[PDB]
């Protein structure tokens, strides 16, 4: 359902160069998971009914960073500012989504297609739209389905983004990595979810909700058994998430 806008050759050249610089920077700084959180969590404010929120660079705004759910994302925004300044032609909206795509690539994940042209929007969406880690499957469908317009398959695949990174007690309050290899993008998130509660690893109530839902569970099983199938579905879901409200 997407009709991507035309951008100039100079814009495209900046995208290509920024992608390379983001690879080096994100790998060096060890911040891929934080960048993926920035891209993905920020895209998740989209409401399809009203066509408000979404991946339009408003997460840069102090007012949106101040939302308690976004604790720590100010670090991500600050880390990217020097690099962003080398590419003044790019929108912040595109830059942040490109950083998320690169985060997945540099950690060994699939190549998520990227299309430029998002325009930086003036108004942050209201607080309260983000997925709540303490809630369950009904809630996930409310946020990803009813608001964002994504599928049940997308919900499970995207939950797999937690295959990289960790929670922090000073940010959300939850603490620790979901996987034993939190800088490696693989299907371990699902393997760990299936194996039970291993000491030292994190499972949010929202992760656990996937195991007991009739639709989500077969997907967890599929991804734990078949990393290729996970990578395919993940790349599709991440692209859709990164493009909510954009190009239709
Ligand atoms: C499914 C609903 C989701 C919930 C309930 C959720 C919740 C959370 C929470 C509570 C944290 C910990 C923040 C902290 O304390 O530092 C977190 C981190 C993270 N999230 Fe999500 N999230 C969701 C969806 C996503 C999606 C769709 C992606 C990307 C595809 C994603 C990527 C990440 C990553 C990579 C981190 C680690 C950040 C770091 O290492 O600093 N999350 N998420
Ligand atoms: Na991992």
In sequence order, the 6+-apart residues with CB closer than 8 A to the CB of 75 are: 34
Other beta carbons within 10 Å of 197: 10
**Alpha-carbon distance values, 228 to 192, 220, 233, 243 (Å):** 17, 13, 9, 23
Q: Is 166 in the pocket of ligand 1 (CB under 6 A)?
A: yes
Resolution, in Å, please? 1.4
Q: Locate tokens 């806008």: which residue?
A: 5
Name the residue at shortest CA distance from atom 17 of ligand 1. 167
* Cβ(33) – ligand 1 distance below 6 Å: yes
CA 40 – CA 101 distance, rounded (Å): 10
Terminal alpha carbon distance of the chain:
7
Cα(57)–Cα(74) distance, rounded to whole angstroms? 13
Q: Where are the alpha helices (DSSP H) in 196-246?
A: 205-212, 216-225, 227-242
Of 86, 75, 79, the residue nearest 18 (C-alpha): 86
Tell me if 103 CB under 6 Å of ligand 1: no
Q: Using CA atoms, how far apart are residues 180 and 160, in angstroms rounded to an integer? A: 14
C-alpha to C-alpha distance for 205 and 139, rounded to whole angstroms: 11
Long-range (24+ apart) CB contacts under 8 A made by 94-99 are 94/15, 94/118, 95/18, 95/57, 96/38, 96/39, 96/42, 96/55, 96/57, 96/59, 96/60, 97/39, 97/43, 97/55, 97/242, 98/15, 98/18, 98/19, 98/22, 99/22, 99/26, 99/35, 99/38, 99/39
41 CA → ligand 1 middle, Å = 7
Q: Which domains does the chain have, with CATH numbers?
A: 1-130+238-248 (1.10.520.10), 131-237 (1.10.420.10)
Assess contact for 99 and 35: CB atoms under 8 A: yes
Query: What is the 3-class SS of 156-193, one letter each residue?
Result: HHHHHHHHCCEECCCCCCCCEECCCCCCCCCCHHHHHH
- Helix spans in 7-123 (H): 9-29, 32-43, 62-65, 73-84, 92-106
Distance CA 196, CA 177 (A): 15
Q: How far apart are CA 76 and CA 33, in angstroms?
A: 10
Q: How far is the CA of 6 from the centre of ligand 2 (A)?
A: 36
Q: Whole-angstrom Cα distance, residue 189 to residue 103?
A: 17
> Method of determination?
X-ray
Read off the DSSP letter of residue 64. H
């Amino acid at each position: 359902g997407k009709s991507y806008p035309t951008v100039s050759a100079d814009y495209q050249k900046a995208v290509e160069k920024a992608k390379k610089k983001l690879r080096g920077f994100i790998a060096e700084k060890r911040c891929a998971p934080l960048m993926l959180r920035l891209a993905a969590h920020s895209a998740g404010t989209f409401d399809k009914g009203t066509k408000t929120g979404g991946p339009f660079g408003t997460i840069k705004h102090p007012a949106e960073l101040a939302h308690s759910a976004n604790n720590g994302l100010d670090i991500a925004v600050r880390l990217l500012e020097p690099l962003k300044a080398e590419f003044p032609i790019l929108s912040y909206a595109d830059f942040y989504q490109l950083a998320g795509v690169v985060a997945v690539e540099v950690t060994g994940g699939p190549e998520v297609p990227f299309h430029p042209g998002r325009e930086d929007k003036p108004e942050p969406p209201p607080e309260g739209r983000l997925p709540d880690a303490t809630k369950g499957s009904d809630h996930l469908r409310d946020v990803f389905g009813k608001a964002m317009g994504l599928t049940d398959q997308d919900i499970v695949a995207l939950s797999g983004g937690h295959t990289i990174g960790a929670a922090h007690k000073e940010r959300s309050g939850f603490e620790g990595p979901w996987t034993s290899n939190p800088l490696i993008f693989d299907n371990s998130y699902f393997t760990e979810l299936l194996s039970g509660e291993k000491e030292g690893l994190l499972q949010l109530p929202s992760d656990k909700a996937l195991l007991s839902d009739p639709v989500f569970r077969p997907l967890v099983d599929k991804y734990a058994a078949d990393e290729d199938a996970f990578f395919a579905d993940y790349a599709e879901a991440h692209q859709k998430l990164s493009e909510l409200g954009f190009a239709d």
